Design a protein around this nucleic acid. Structure first.
Length: 56
DNA sequence: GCGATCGC
DNA sequence: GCGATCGC
C-alpha cells in the first residue's frame, strides 16, 4: 500500500503507509475513504481521510 | 445519524 | 461500548 501524506495528531506532516484502509459511506451516497495510521514518533493510532482515488 | 473500522 | 475519522 502506498504512503499517504497526512497530518499526525502531534501536528507534523508525514508520508505514512496506513495499516488498514476502507470506504466509509452511507448507502446510496458518496462517502470518504479512511485509513488507520500509527504516529511514527508517539505510537498513537489515528484515522485520517485518504485521497478519493486511493486503492481499497 | 449514517456508513466501517478498531484501539482503547 | 465509545471516540474518532468526513461530508452530507
Amino acid at each position: 500500500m502506498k504512503p499517504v501524506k497526512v497530518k499526525t495528531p502531534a501536528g507534523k506532516e508525514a508520508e505514512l503507509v496506513p495499516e488498514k484502509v476502507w470506504a466509509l459511506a452511507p448507502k446510496g451516497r458518496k462517502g470518504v475513504k479512511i485509513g488507520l495510521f500509527k504516529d511514527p514518533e508517539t505510537g498513537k493510532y489515528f484515522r485520517h481521510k485518504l485521497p478519493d482515488d486511493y486503492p481499497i
